[PDB]
Design a protein around this ligand. Sequence first.
Ligand SMILES: N[C@@H](CCC(=O)O)C(=O)O
Ligand SMILES: N[C@@H](CCC(=O)O)C(=O)O
Ligand SMILES: N[C@@H](CCC(=O)O)C(=O)O
Ligand SMILES: N[C@@H](CCC(=O)O)C(=O)O
Ligand SMILES: [Mg+2]
Ligand SMILES: [Mg+2]
Ligand SMILES: [Mg+2]
Ligand SMILES: [Mg+2]
Lengths: 252, 252
Amino acid sequence: MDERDALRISREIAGEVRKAIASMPLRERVKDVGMGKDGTPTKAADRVAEDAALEILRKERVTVVTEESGVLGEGDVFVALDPLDGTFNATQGIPVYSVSLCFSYSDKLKDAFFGYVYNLATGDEYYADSSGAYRNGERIEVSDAEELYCNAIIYYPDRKFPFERMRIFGSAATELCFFADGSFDCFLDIRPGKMLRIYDAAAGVFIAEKAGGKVTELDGESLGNKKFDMQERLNIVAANEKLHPKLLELIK
Amino acid sequence: MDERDALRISREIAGEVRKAIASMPLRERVKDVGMGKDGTPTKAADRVAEDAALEILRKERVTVVTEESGVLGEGDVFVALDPLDGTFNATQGIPVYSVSLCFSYSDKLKDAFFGYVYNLATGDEYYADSSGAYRNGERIEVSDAEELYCNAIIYYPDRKFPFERMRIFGSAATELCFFADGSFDCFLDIRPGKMLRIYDAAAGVFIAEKAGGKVTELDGESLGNKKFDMQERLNIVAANEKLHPKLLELIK
Ligand SMILES: N[C@@H](CCC(=O)O)C(=O)O
Ligand SMILES: N[C@@H](CCC(=O)O)C(=O)O
Ligand SMILES: N[C@@H](CCC(=O)O)C(=O)O
Ligand SMILES: N[C@@H](CCC(=O)O)C(=O)O
Ligand SMILES: [Mg+2]
Ligand SMILES: [Mg+2]
Ligand SMILES: [Mg+2]
Ligand SMILES: [Mg+2]
């Protein structure tokens, strides 16, 4: 498989998932229909998303690692799938929720060759391949903010901070893209519990780096060795090269 | 003027403001074109919104209190107008920004008879009148959550909190409506600076109360005497009547 296949596949998936969710009323979306392999409830909105995405992905030779159904398939190409990221928003009809896909040539993030995040409520399309990073067909890049007085997405603020704005939109995959396109100056998930799973962050990290951002773990460590498995967990500190080390200091 | 006139007027305004913003590219939206009477800069997105709104409102016998141009007109009916609430989101193409209108028979919020918040990115319509509170024509009401382990919109978290979720979307008028329709269990603006202006909150507070929520200042004082002027500022604690006192305690 190559980055063209992955774009094609991701778009087909985006199409079907969007259709499926859009036809499900909010009262159905919000129903708890099962337990996911990740250890959190699967809502009806999650199940329909994942079913639609897997219908397409299983026709391919990949190992899929996805939130509700866990690990599936046997291909040498690994795909990290969040069939619905921002499920709470989707259940409330709040326009920030996405399907997220990251394709890698091994079970480690350093081998990612394609990343794709699609806002299911608005139609906004983010992806990145070897040619750069895109939002709705147009090249994007991270902001050049250097001061701590910047616009931050942060999970979660638990002390006074120097930021100009703090926002928390409820979909990490999309919010990483809000960072990737310059909307926000940084994305921080510093929750001590280390809550992000590989399928939450992977596409967002790949897109953000291709947009020029520096994206690391809590302590500046590379994310390259994060595994595409259900056990993997992440903290993220992401910002342009100038701002990144300042934030690392700040959150010490 | 009555509540039906206000619905009509608000819808006409929503239509034109939506048109005006939609046709304006993000690179133009974000331009700083002037200073607002509020004391914050006026973005070109703000200006085109306010102009479209005032074109319609001036044709009415009202006193308008609006962010960019301040206090206008002479009528006995006061209208608090945020022509564009969530301007930052609108400049980045993040789908949470709104026009907000609150109509009152005096210059105090206790005399409000109509409130209206319209998401310019999605077309979502919130309003409340004597018949109740609505979202896209459907009656809404606040959530029945009783525990501090709830879903919270809070500006800004600065300590450890017991919430299940914390979100900050960047449009106070809309976020009060997220509270009003039950999507979130509470809305909290407890920023010590007391930042919210009357046009940010008025419509949201009226809609939230009509939806059954309890909405007060920091200390539980009624918001009834808040003035429709440029000097007015607000903190807000809003939740159902069961949860509300617990939150008052939590931040005490
Ligand atoms: N909304 C599109 C997503 C991909 C695209 O065509 O840009 C679809 O129907 O698949
Ligand atoms: N129309 C978009 C999403 C829905 C919308 O337009 O709001 C799409 O085809 O994906
Ligand atoms: N007020 C909405 C339309 C609602 C309606 O008239 O049914 C708009 O013009 O943006
Ligand atoms: N502002 C457009 C958004 C388009 C859409 O989300 O369908 C509306 O009237 O709804
Ligand atoms: Mg789950
Ligand atoms: Mg999910
Ligand atoms: Mg201003
Ligand atoms: Mg404004």
